[PDB]
Design an enzyme around this catalytic site. Structure first.
Site, PDB file in Angstrom:
ATOM      1  N   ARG A   1     -24.149  -2.443  10.466  1.00 48.44           N
ATOM      2  CA  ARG A   1     -24.014  -3.611   9.454  1.00 48.44           C
ATOM      3  C   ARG A   1     -25.097  -3.992   8.446  1.00 48.44           C
ATOM      4  NH1 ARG A   1     -26.382  -6.729  13.889  1.00 48.44           N
ATOM      5  NH2 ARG A   1     -24.270  -6.770  14.201  1.00 48.44           N
TER       6      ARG A   1
ATOM      7  N   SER B   1     -32.517   3.460   5.922  1.00 53.81           N
ATOM      8  CA  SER B   1     -33.924   1.941   6.204  1.00 53.81           C
ATOM      9  C   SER B   1     -32.335   0.974   6.856  1.00 53.81           C
ATOM     10  CB  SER B   1     -34.342   1.780   5.807  1.00 53.81           C
ATOM     11  OG  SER B   1     -34.045   1.427   4.276  1.00 53.81           O
TER      12      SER B   1
ATOM     13  N   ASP C   1     -35.709   3.988   8.720  1.00 56.96           N
ATOM     14  CA  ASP C   1     -37.721   4.019   8.406  1.00 56.96           C
ATOM     15  C   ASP C   1     -38.521   4.584   8.757  1.00 56.96           C
ATOM     16  OD1 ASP C   1     -36.203   1.891   8.408  1.00 56.96           O
ATOM     17  OD2 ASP C   1     -37.284   1.240   7.002  1.00 56.96           O
TER      18      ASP C   1
HETATM   19  O1  LIG Z   1     -36.421  -1.480   6.123  1.00 53.77           O
HETATM   20  C1  LIG Z   1     -37.081  -2.034   7.859  1.00 53.77           C
HETATM   21  C2  LIG Z   1     -35.628  -2.451   8.828  1.00 53.77           C
HETATM   22  O2  LIG Z   1     -34.917  -3.856   8.108  1.00 53.77           O
HETATM   23  C3  LIG Z   1     -33.893  -3.969   8.158  1.00 53.77           C
HETATM   24  O3  LIG Z   1     -34.190  -4.824   9.784  1.00 53.77           O
HETATM   25  C4  LIG Z   1     -33.039  -3.261   9.043  1.00 53.77           C
HETATM   26  O4  LIG Z   1     -32.218  -1.823   8.160  1.00 53.77           O
HETATM   27  C5  LIG Z   1     -33.980  -1.794   9.241  1.00 53.77           C
HETATM   28  O5  LIG Z   1     -32.471  -0.873  10.598  1.00 53.77           O
HETATM   29  C6  LIG Z   1     -35.236  -1.864   9.043  1.00 53.77           C
HETATM   30  O6  LIG Z   1     -35.448  -0.494   9.560  1.00 53.77           O
END
Ligand SMILES: OC[C@H]1O[C@H](O)[C@@H](O)[C@@H](O)[C@@H]1O
Ligand SMILES: OC[C@H]1O[C@H](O)[C@@H](O)[C@@H](O)[C@@H]1O
Lengths: 480, 480
Positions: free
Chosen positions: A166, A151, A205
């Site tokens: 990042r 995620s 995610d």
């Molecule tokens: O978890 C929700 C969202 O959080 C952040 O914005 C990032 O790490 C995304 O890649 C992820 O989809």
């Protein structure tokens, strides 16, 4: 009662107002940023300040009839790590075995050095423990396919490859940036005798949320509810959608032509809309938001939309408001521990304030503030703190509707068959559990260019993909 | 293919349109009829032509923490009879065991005489069979309490007593009218050795639906979703709500004062809104509706709102339209069996037409019409039948919203605390399974005086609990 504190609070609450005209503007601008983000950038992807619009190399929405042998799944979020085995039975059914565990605070701190090997060794060992507990009888040579739900923003290059752009959501591991997370994970699995476990898919995610909902949605529900967006409103925020291959100009034209000849028409796009308008050309901004981005955030200058919306930051906004009111000599922080403790006020704290009632003298607000940072309060102070919380959350929910409306408008998603509505699969603690957050998103959708009639055709459905079905569906497709 | 048939169908479809102004008129009129119906009728209750507004003698909404030993429940609908045992565990949880069985066609044929003893003896034997299967060890040894869900208008006199006012739906047992259905049922239980089973509560299926939702609604959901209406859209249609004791003028003033002194403030009202506007002062009416009310219905002159809305009658509307188009020499019924077979076209048949698609040449519509009445069709004929079906169902759903909007307006239900919304517990095959019915009800709510902002505060939730939990909660309260 302090009339100067009351007017200061009412004035600050006005700083968080988002009007109908603003929603229209942000919706329009979001679409522009989508189109810009779909062009190839000859700069560094880590330097890019626009809307990432990352191709996921997922081209097929599950029908629900997918089936196969048991797949493995690993899911690294902002708070928990899960390992699962998913047996897809077709007909929207599946068997899941999973183990969930909190990410140790060790990986979120800077006092001691954290390396990528620490993270992925920990994940490989959890995988080893899961296989020992739930599939001991399985041969040690069994050819496991694993889908990896990661995620975090990844420069996806194929279904099974992509380098971390990042970290977000408080993760601080310097050496992971620029590294292929599937290879890092695979190497640690190899090192503990699990070389027979092949990580064959990598999904965000958001992507997993959309796929899992497409598979699980029954034939009757799917008939009149078409999943068009998988999105997240938890620690962070993000969402994905299906874009026409022809519009993904950053995708290699030969790859586009190959996919088109195979019968594909769309590819899922991870928008990373947490990084919407990182330049702040239009996003509502207060001094508190600037302070959070520049001083207290791990990624200053990036993910600015997320910093106004997601649960990691809403409590921190309130803290900076109370600190500013103390400097103004309007609010007495007494013996609290708010000062010098970024993120000590959580969105979980705010959730106890949002719908607290004066009939009980706002006792939940008092207890939450005492439990969080030992902040004693009077009833009158709690009445005003509640106003501040509600302004913060309403702005977050109104902004949360903008990316969804924009996607629906750009893709003409509300043009469907008779009675068919569009489904937006939502996961995350804020949209799911923050009282009123969904209701305010729906209000904002009705205020957006899709209008009240468009909002009625939109179903914000809580659809959790914590069991790894999304990753499992991608692994099922891929080759071992 | 035939322009004259196409224009005839479009003209018939226009007869079923319900405008915003009409919804406003009907919503206002429904409130007037509510207030009239809360007065004593000053005539026979069986002669009364107004909105029945029957007091149910239920004064307390379950909290969800009710618990006790296993209760029994029996539920007589228009199609099935089911017996179940419910163990209320508190904390919004319960264990249910149930057996469902069709009401024999013997009870649906006037070719032979049917008596109340036939019906309730059959119900008592089914109860005995349920206890033999699921509670064999304690069938004859337990002091069973049973709640009786009787989905027909009853002149309720207490929680455990009430006389059948009149049959509805496909039922007609003359000697039941005017008789206490609890005594009729209890007597037959006594006659088969089940005198230890005491029917201690009598509820309408609307009342049971509301109670079940109040109990099952979680603390978090209940906090921002207050169940205010339990309603039905199946074979028939009806709904209940909580009325202030002071407004229930037909209630004996001594009973009102007694209840008020006990701390009660409201009593659930079974509106019987199927009988809304039996005089047709404002209800949309076509020649097909009149023919159904006067020639083919079991209760001519009553339940006229239901005859435009509920599932027993929507298919019969289509039948009368096709017969009218044949007399006009515009539609070829070929060797069908529609003529002289009232109710051979069911709403289940229409449910297969509503969202059938021309991309498949409307094959589902073709099969459904052949299976229902051996009606062969051409593609063009199916296209036009689909138009008729959609006009019929849209009118049913738009009217279905009127009683809900009226109740919410009369009781000021949308005037609540911050973020708090109202929940409308819905059960029945039409609202649950007829594609698009719920979506069209929501459109009509947005057109009603509560407006689009009111519709967003209304949640039409499909009751996944049933009327057995509601009856069990009443039995738990009552004394053996
Ligand atoms: O978890 C929700 C969202 O959080 C952040 O914005 C990032 O790490 C995304 O890649 C992820 O989809
Ligand atoms: O079953 C729904 C509804 O159908 C009819 O309108 C009547 O028999 C009502 O008593 C009942 O509540």
């Amino acid at each position: 009662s302090d009339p100067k504190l009351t007017k200061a609070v009412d004035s600050i609450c006005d700083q968080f107002i988002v009007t109908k005209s603003k929603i229209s503007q942000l919706t329009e601008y979001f679409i522009d940023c989508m189109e810009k983000g779909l062009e190839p950038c000859e700069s560094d992807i880590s330097q890019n300040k626009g809307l990432p619009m990352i191709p996921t190399f997922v081209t097929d929405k599950p029908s629900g009839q997918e089936h196969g042998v048991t797949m493995l799944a690993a899911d690294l979020g902002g708070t928990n790590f899960r390992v699962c085995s998913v047996e897809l039975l077709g007909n929207h059914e599946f068997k899941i075995e999973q183990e969930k565990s909190k990410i140790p605070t060790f990986f979120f701190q800077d006092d001691h050095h954290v390396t990528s090997k620490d993270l992925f060794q920990h994940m490989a060992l959890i995988t080893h423990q899961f296989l020992t507990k739930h599939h001991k009888d399985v041969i040690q040579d069994y050819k496991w396919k694993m889908g990896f739900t990661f995620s975090y923003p990844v420069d996806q290059t194929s279904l099974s490859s992509g380098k971390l752009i990042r970290w977000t959501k408080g993760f601080k591991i310097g050496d992971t940036v620029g590294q292929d997370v599937v290879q890092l994970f695979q190497q640690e699995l190899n090192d503990i005798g699990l070389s027979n476990v092949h990580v064959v898919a990598l999904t965000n995610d958001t992507t997993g949320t959309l796929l899992a909902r497409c598979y699980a949605s029954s034939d009757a529900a799917r008939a009149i509810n078409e999943p068009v967006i998988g999105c997240i409103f938890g620690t962070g925020t993000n969402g994905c959608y299906m874009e026409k291959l022809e519009n993904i100009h950053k995708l290699d034209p030969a790859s586009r032509e190959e996919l088109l000849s195979q019968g594909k028409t769309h590819m899922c796009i991870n928008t990373e809309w947490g990084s919407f308008d990182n330049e702040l050309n239009h996003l509502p901004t207060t001094s508190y938001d600037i302070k959070i981005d520049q001083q207290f955030s791990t990624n200053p200058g990036f993910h600015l939309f997320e910093k106004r919306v997601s649960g990691l930051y809403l409590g921190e906004i309130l803290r900076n408001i109370l600190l500013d009111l103390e400097k103004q000599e309007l609010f007495d922080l007494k013996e609290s521990v708010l000062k010098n403790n970024p993120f000590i006020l959580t969105t979980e704290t705010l959730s106890h304030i949002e719908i607290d009632t004066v009939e009980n003298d706002l006792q939940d607000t008092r207890d939450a503030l005492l439990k969080a940072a030992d902040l004693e309060t009077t009833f009158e102070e709690r009445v005003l703190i509640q106003k501040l919380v509600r302004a913060i959350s309403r702005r977050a929910a109104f902004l949360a509707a903008v990316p969804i409306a924009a996607i629906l408008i750009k893709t003409n998603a509300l043009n469907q068959s008779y009675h068919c509505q569009v489904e937006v699969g939502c996961d995350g603690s804020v949209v799911e559990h923050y009282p009123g957050f969904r209701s305010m998103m729906r209000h904002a959708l009705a205020l957006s260019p899709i209008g009240p009639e468009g909002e009625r055709d939109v179903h914000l459905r809580i659809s959790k993909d914590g069991s790894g079905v999304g990753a499992a569906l991608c692994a099922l497709h891929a080759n071992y």
